[PDB]
Every structure is written in C-alpha cells, then in structure tokens.
Amino acid sequence: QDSLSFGFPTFPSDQKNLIFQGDAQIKNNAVQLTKTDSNGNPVASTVGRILFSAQVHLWEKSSSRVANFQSQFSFSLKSPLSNGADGIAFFIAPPDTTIPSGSGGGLLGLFAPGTAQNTSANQVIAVEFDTFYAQDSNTWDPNYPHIGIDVNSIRSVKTVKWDRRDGQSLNVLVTFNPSTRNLDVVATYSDGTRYEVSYEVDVRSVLPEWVRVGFSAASGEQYQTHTLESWSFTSTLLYT
Amino acid sequence: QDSLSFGFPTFPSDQKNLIFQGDAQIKNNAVQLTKTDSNGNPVASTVGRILFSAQVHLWEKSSSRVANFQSQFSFSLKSPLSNGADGIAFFIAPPDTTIPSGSGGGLLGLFAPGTAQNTSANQVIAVEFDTFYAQDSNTWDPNYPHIGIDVNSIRSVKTVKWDRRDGQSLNVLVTFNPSTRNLDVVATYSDGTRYEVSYEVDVRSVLPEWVRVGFSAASGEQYQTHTLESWSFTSTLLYT
Ligand SMILES: OC[C@H]1O[C@H](O[C@@H]2[C@H](O)[C@@H](O)O[C@H](CO)[C@H]2O)[C@@H](O)[C@@H](O)[C@@H]1O
Ligand SMILES: [Ca+2]
Ligand SMILES: [Ca+2]
Ligand SMILES: [Mn+2]
Ligand SMILES: [Mn+2]
C-alpha cells in the first residue's frame, strides 16, 4: 500500500497485529515493554520491544517517492529509585529485526555491544528518551537525561536536555517530512512543558524500502517501568 | 488497533502485506485473481484470492463496539467468450480462511460444495459481481448477471440486476454503518451508470471479532480475467 495508518488509543490484551519480542507484554490496557514482578514493580536486567506486523513502504526507488510519516504516542516511567533506567525508544528498522544479543541496559535493546557506535554496521533510526547517563557504562551520552535522535548509532546525532517525571505521561509527536527531510520530535507533559529536537536525514540512505516500526526499552542494573499507553501511526508515499 | 486503513492506488509487483492464495498474482500493476496464459488471456479452471495481512478488529465484545468500515475498489473483467465466468467478490472472513476444496466455478472460491447453501456451516460476508447464471449449474442464481450480498451462503440474501461490460472498470464503494447495521453497496461505470443495493445485517452474529478482508474470483469451464485495479480500506471501532 502507498498509504497505511493505525491507531491504538489503548492496548487491550486481545492483540493480533503486534510482534512481541523479549519481555514485552500487555498488562492493564497498556504495553509493559520491560518486565515487572507480581506486585507490578520494575525489575533489573530486562529488555522488550514491539513491532506492528504490517510492513511500511518507506520509499520506492521505482517511482522516486519517499513517504512522510507521523507517529503519535504517550508513555510513562515509574520507579522506586530516584535514578530509573534505561529508557524507551521509538524505532524504524528492517522487517526482520530482532533483539541483538547483549543489547540490554544503555543499548536500549537496539544495538549490539561490539557495533553500537559503528554507523556502517547498523540500519536503524530511533528517537530515544534516555534517563541514565553514567559515564562508566554510557560513555556516549551527554551528562544529563535527554531525548535524542539516533541514526545507526547509540551515540545520538542530536539531543536535547529532558526532564524525567516519575509516573507522568509524556505525549510525543514524531514527524518526517520527505520534502525537507526533517525528522521533528515534539514532546510535552500535561502542564505544557515542551521539548523539541530535529535533524535532517535522508531515510533512503539509511533504511531499506520496506521497514517495520515499533518501540524498544530496557533496564540494566537500574530499573523503571516503560509503559506505552497509546500509539497512532500514518505514512503516505509522496513525490517531492 | 481500534482503527486501520490502507490504500493501493495501484499494485506494484513488490508486495509485502498481501496474502496470495490459489492462482492470484500481480501483473502490470494490477492483481490478476484468476490465471492467465503467457499472452495474458484467461484460462479455465482457476481460482485465486488475496487478503490483507493485518487483521481487522470488526467488533469487540468487552466494549460493545462495532466497526464502521468502507472499502473502495475498482476492477475490470475481460473475455473473448460471450459468457465469461464466474465472477469476483470482496469478502470478510475469519483470519485463517483458505480456499475451500472444490470451491471453483460458481462457488467463487468462497464455499465448499457440500455446505455452499448451509448458513450454519459458514462464516463469511461477501459482495459478489456474478456474471455466470446458467440455471442448470448455478441453480441458486437469478437468471441474469447480478450484484449480490452473500451472508454465509452462495445463494445471495439479495441481488440487483447488473450489466457486465467487457474491459470497462467498475468503481465500487462498500460501507457498513454499525448504528443502522446497513451494508451499502454502490457501483458505477465511467459513464455514470449506477447500481445500488443495501442489506441490514448484525455482523456480530456472523463473524468473529477479528477478521481478514480481501477478494476472491474463479472461472470454471467458462472464463474471463478478474483484474483488481485499486483498493482502499478503512475501519474504526465505534460505540453502539
Ligand atoms: O541500568 C543502568 C546501567 O546498568 C549497568 O551499568 C551499571 C551502571 O553504570 C551503574 O550502576 O554502575 C555499575 C557499576 O559500574 C554499572 O555496571 C549496565 O547494564 C548499563 O548498560 C546500564 O545503562
Ligand atoms: Ca543512556
Ligand atoms: Ca454464478
Ligand atoms: Mn542517550
Ligand atoms: Mn450469484
């Protein structure tokens, strides 16, 4: 299809079009990307991701078209600790993507340790909401919580200072305009606090024509729940 | 997802989200549901169907919601014969639906001979464009080409006279309004000729909560090409 759109206002347990990887599962009408115990508390050493089953036609060499896309979603992070880890990310990757071995903790379930910073060995675009930045283990991170745009590397090409708020839902709008090639990210808390980050990227040189979209999250030694509450997505191939 | 939509203005050979069954295949940016030889001419004894891979949430018990959906599509039929057969149909069925054994010819690849007219043995809603009505073989048909609404039986719950036009595209809009429970069908040729037929049906009594949508066509001893040229579909769950 030249166009595709879907909307999940909530996430009932009766799911048919979601690919669950790692510890991800539906609980209380929301997707819990990382593992939790019986009491519902987050646990250490867990990775989880979800992908929508239908493949998205991001670009078509045949007609020289590139798709625009808009992903809107909300999530909340909760933890008994003051420094919850590691973060959640919206990502786009080849259809057969799977959790790389050893991609836990700060690698957010998106990159393999040995090639996490090698841009020629990866095929992924992600928008991360990173809450852990200790320089001993996350040497690639700025020294503060942040939102970042990742293009084939865990070391973001662009970041913006962000504030983690335990239990509060963050509303996010990610849009890609093929005409300007700008990937824009706008995130806001209910009180109006807004964060914005943008980057120019030619998706044709990073990803294959058909891709899958989804979310990934992980917790290493530090932990927090990564609860995806809602998600809507739309893409349309355009000639610019 | 509560809502899903996709659009195929045309059908390029590079498909990822279509399930091809039988002889269905893409040729010249269109779906040829029934087999054609090297020259593109129709042949006898062929059946083919396509389904969109993502499952559609038609209704939800827990929330008492039912989907409002619309399916717009265009097709053309061509045959050197004076009595091209057998017809094409848009259908909705359980996700694991496959071509029934012996469902060729007048059964349009949708029903098995033994239970084709047993409403308790089937789970399918289809809108058929039936071009073959020989009273000796297709005993269930009115004596003329017709558009029919099929609910669990090859014997349409209702039909309207229709004119088959060789090589001309027919544009069809099929919609279902959960508030009135009306399934409406409007079909038009490029010269303004219009056909309309409606039927009140509670889809919850006929189909499971999750279903797949697609097209089916077949040719028995008589034949014609059944070319699906374009297709767009949208569905959203509504209170009810
Ligand atoms: O989950 C946070 C973090 O945990 C693990 O690294 C640890 C932290 O840097 C901190 O707790 O100090 C530990 C001792 O130096 C260190 O192991 C990793 O899983 C890391 O990837 C993750 O970001
Ligand atoms: Ca980090
Ligand atoms: Ca017939
Ligand atoms: Mn980071
Ligand atoms: Mn009929």
Extents of the domains making up chain A: 2-240
C-alpha separations of B178 from B13, B60, B236 in Å: 35, 12, 10
Q: Which residue has the tokens 């798709």?
A: A67
B191 with B15: CB under 8 angstroms? no
Q: Is A156 helix (H, G, I), strand (E, B) or coil?
A: coil
Side chain identity, residue A158: K
Q: Is B203 helix (H, G, I), strand (E, B) or coil?
A: helix
Token digits for B209? 């909560």
Taking the C-alpha atoms of residue A122 and residue B40, their distance in angstroms, rounded to an integer, is: 43
Beta bridge partners of A28: none
Taking the C-alpha atoms of residue A133 and residue A141, their distance in angstroms, rounded to an integer, is: 6
Asked if B12 lies within 8 A of A54 by C-beta distance, the reply is no
- Phi, psi (deg, nearest 5) at residue A204: -60, -30
Side chain identity, residue B99: I
Residue B146 among known ligand-binding residues: yes
Token digits for B203? 């889809």
Nearest chain A CA: its distance from B6 CA (Å): 4
Token digits for B55? 């499952």
B95 with B212: CB under 8 angstroms? yes
Taking the C-alpha atoms of residue A237 and residue B140, their distance in angstroms, rounded to an integer, is: 44
Q: What is the dihedral of CA B216, B222, B225, B230, to 10 degrees?
A: -40
Taking the C-alpha atoms of residue A183 and residue B86, their distance in angstroms, rounded to an integer, is: 50
- Phi, psi (deg, nearest 5) at residue B28: 55, 50
Method: X-ray
Q: Which residues of B164-197 are buried (b: 16+ CB within 10 A; e: fewer)?
A: beeeebbebebbbebeeeebbbebbeeeeeebeb
B198 with B177: CB under 8 angstroms? no
Asked if A6 lies within 8 A of B9 by C-beta distance, the reply is no
Q: Which residue has the tokens 């206002």?
A: A9
A191 Cα to the center of ligand 1, angstroms: 32
Contact residues for A119 (Cβ-Cβ < 8 A; gap 6+): A151, A152, A153
- Phi, psi (deg, nearest 5) at residue B113: -50, -45
Contacts of B12 in chain A (CB under 8 A): 60, 62
Taking the C-alpha atoms of residue B219 and residue B107, their distance in angstroms, rounded to an integer, is: 9
Taking the C-alpha atoms of residue A203 and residue B9, their distance in angstroms, rounded to an integer, is: 23
Q: Which residues of A89-117 are buried (b: 16+ CB within 10 A; e: fewer)?
A: bbbbbeeebebbeebbbbbbbbbeeeebe
CATH 2.60.120.200 fits A2-240, yes or no: yes
Ligand nearest to the CA of A219: 1
Would you call the peptide bond into B86 cis, given omega within 30 degrees of 0 as the criterion? yes
Query: Does residue A106 come out as left (phi exceeding 0), alpha (psi in the -120 to 50 range) or beta?
Result: alpha
- What is the experimental resolution, given in Å to one decimal place? 1.9
Residue B152 among known ligand-binding residues: no
Mutate to test the pocket of ligand 1, among A130, A143, A222 (most ligand atoms within 8 A of CB): A222
Distance of CA A27 to the CA centre of its chain: 19
